[PDB]
Amino acid sequence: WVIP
Amino acid sequence: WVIP
Amino acid sequence: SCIQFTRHASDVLLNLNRLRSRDILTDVVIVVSREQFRAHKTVLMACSGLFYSIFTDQLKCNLSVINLDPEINPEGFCILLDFMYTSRLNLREGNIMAVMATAMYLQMEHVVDTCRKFIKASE
Amino acid sequence: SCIQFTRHASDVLLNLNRLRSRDILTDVVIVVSREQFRAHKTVLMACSGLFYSIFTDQLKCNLSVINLDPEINPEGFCILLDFMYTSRLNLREGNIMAVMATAMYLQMEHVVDTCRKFIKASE
Ligand SMILES: N#Cc1cnn2c(Nc3ccc4c(c3)CC(=O)N4)cc(Cl)nc12
Ligand SMILES: N#Cc1cnn2c(Nc3ccc4c(c3)CC(=O)N4)cc(Cl)nc12
Ligand SMILES: [Cl-]
Ligand SMILES: [Cl-]
């Protein structure tokens, strides 16, 4: 999971 | 396009 | 010896979400209490262990309407359906419990994982 | 303020290809001369300007069989259909001309681009  |  | 187009999977998913927004070729309505959500069975199966089981069933595969458990929160379902079609999860303090419970029911393991990690960090 | 699962779009496409291999929820047969290819209209539209136009048409949207132009090469179509479902293009010296012509007909601009670049490098 990432900060887009 | 890339070499996978 | 294949070559691969990096953005292809994302581009496909973007167009599947465009089809959902325009209600093109949607073949099921998911009923969550008083709310209704139109979707494509193939996308639902591709994202969820629950829908994969439902739509491989020789009778349920042909249903146009699926009613979820009355304990399922419509907003939680909405957030997860948006995630299915975009890879983006609107995870907030006010919705995390409902999102995690819906993700457990829908059998969306990666979403359950992150909900667990976000809750653990706040305790 | 969304979070994003990097592998989600690829995972969706992998499951859509699994559905195609098992012939689950396929809703169209593409006829290319003597050969037949089963697929999902939604995936075809998401990948191809030609299929996007065909399946948004108020009459063609309901057809279970689509016949392509007799000039279309079945192997070229097969390679492009595999690409649609996997992001992988089996581009070879012996098939590049057929792949590029099929990609132009199907309106798959990124595939046409690369075929053009690979041909230019050999001249
Ligand atoms: N054919 C087919 C096919 C269509 N969909 N699909 C799967 N869908 C799925 C099943 C379980 C889970 C998820 C997705 C996300 C998750 O956390 N669990 C799996 C397989 Cl093995 N195959 C298929
Ligand atoms: N709704 C919808 C929807 C479903 N599919 N789809 C598009 N599919 C498409 C149209 C043109 C081209 C390609 C894909 C690849 C290419 O080279 N050209 C576009 C839009 Cl703008 N919208 C949609
Ligand atoms: Cl997930
Ligand atoms: Cl393309």
Ligand with minimal distance to C24 CA: 2
CA distance B2 to chain D (A): 10
Separation of CA C43 from chain center: 8
Q: Could you tell me the two tokens for D50? A: 């030609």
Q: Could you tell me the two tokens for D20? A: 């195609």
User: CA D110, D111, D112, D116 torsion: positive or negative?
Assistant: positive
Tell me C69's DSSP state.
P
Question: How far does the centroid of ligand 1 lie from the alpha carbon of residue C111, in Å?
Answer: 14
Rounded Cα gap, residues C16 and C43, in angstroms: 8
Q: Could you tell me the two tokens for C4? A: 């691969």
Rounded Cα gap, residues D20 and D24, in angstroms: 6
Q: How many other CB atoms sit within 10 Å of the CB of residue C78? A: 18
Which residues 6+ apart lie within 8 Å of D104 measured at CB? Answer: D112
Which residues 6+ apart lie within 8 Å of D115 measured at CB? Answer: D91, D96, D99, D100, D103
| Pair D55, D44: CB distance under 8 Å | yes
E-assigned strands of C1-123?
A: 3-4, 28-32, 35-39, 65-67, 88-89
Question: 3-state DSSP call for residue C108?
Answer: coil
| Pair C91, C118: CB distance under 8 Å | yes
Say how many residues make up chain C: 123
Rounded Cα gap, residues C87 and D6, in angstroms: 7
Pairing of strands D88-89, D65-67: unpaired
Tell me D39's DSSP state.
E
Rounded Cα gap, residues D12 and D123, in angstroms: 39
Q: Which residue has the tokens 């009778």?
A: C59
Question: 3-state DSSP call for residue C14?
Answer: helix
| Listed residue (C50, C54, C79) closest to C65, CA to CA | C54
**Environment class of D110 (CB within 10 Å of its CB; exposed 0-12, middle 13-18, buried 19+):** middle
Q: Which residue has the tokens 């994982």?
A: C113
The method recorded for this entry reads X-ray
| CB-defined site of ligand 2, < 6 Å | C 15, 18-19, 22, 24; D 45-49, 52, 107-109
Rounded Cα gap, residues D63 and D80, in angstroms: 21
| Listed residue (C55, C3, D8) closest to B2, CA to CA | C3
Question: 3-state DSSP call for residue D104?
Answer: helix
Measured between alpha carbons, how far is residue C17 from residues C5, C33, D43, D70, D111 in Å? 20, 23, 11, 33, 22
Tell me C25's DSSP state.
S
Q: Which residue has the tokens 């030609």?
A: D50
Amino acid, res. D35: E
Q: Which residue has the tokens 């907030």?
A: C92
Resolution in A: 1.9
Nearest to C89 among D3, D41, D89 (CB): D3
Rounded Cα gap, residues C114 and C108, in angstroms: 11
| Listed residue (C82, C122, C121, C120) closest to C99, CA to CA | C82
Residue C121, H or E segment? helix C109-122
Rounded Cα gap, residues C117 and C121, in angstroms: 6
Say how many residues make up chain B: 4
Q: Give the domain ranges of chain C.
A: 1-123
Separation of CA B1 from chain center: 5
| CATH assignment of D1-123, among 3.30.710.10, 3.60.20.10, 3.40.190.10, 3.30.565.10 | 3.30.710.10
Nearest to B4 among D88, D110, D114 (CB): D88
Q: Which residue has the tokens 């006829």?
A: D31
